[PDB]
Design a protein around this ligand. Structure first.
Ligand SMILES: [Cl-]
Ligand SMILES: [Cl-]
Ligand SMILES: [Pd+2]
Ligand SMILES: [Pd+2]
Length: 129
């Protein structure tokens, strides 16, 4: 599923991401935009052989089991395929564990390079939340 901007914001807010660990909703929407272009089915392979999955491009090296990432962890206790659903529950649940791990949203390279220190509020401008 390819979300609309405000549609995703509203879904993220319902699942409790708005100011989760102090990250305003706009941070999350910005991260999603630059990770997946709001596409729940996005997959990209990393140089290490791990793969990133879903709306927030969660990585198989640490967070999910894709059956093909030797020496990896499954810290969200999920198959990576769960991260590709039109229902964003697994992605958001797992994102909350990632961002609580010490490094915050810096775990998302696109957030660090494209969203961090920007006017992220613009990403929720106009939306009914
Ligand atoms: Cl959730
Ligand atoms: Cl929940
Ligand atoms: Pd939820
Ligand atoms: Pd949902």
């Amino acid at each position: 599923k390819v979300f609309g901007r405000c549609e995703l914001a509203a879904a993220m807010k319902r699942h409790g991401l708005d100011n989760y660990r102090g990250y305003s909703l706009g941070n999350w929407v910005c991260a999603a935009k630059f990770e997946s272009n709001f596409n729940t089915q996005a997959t990209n392979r990393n140089t290490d052989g791990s793969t990133d999955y879903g709306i927030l491009q969660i990585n198989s090296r640490w967070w999910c089991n894709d059956g093909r990432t030797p020496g990896s962890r499954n810290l969200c206790n999920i198959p990576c395929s769960a991260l590709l659903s039109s229902d964003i529950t697994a992605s958001v649940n797992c994102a909350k564990k990632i961002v609580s791990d010490g490094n915050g949203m810096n775990a998302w390279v696109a957030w660090r390079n494209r969203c961090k220190g920007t006017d992220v509020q613009a990403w929720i401008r106009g939306c009914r939340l």
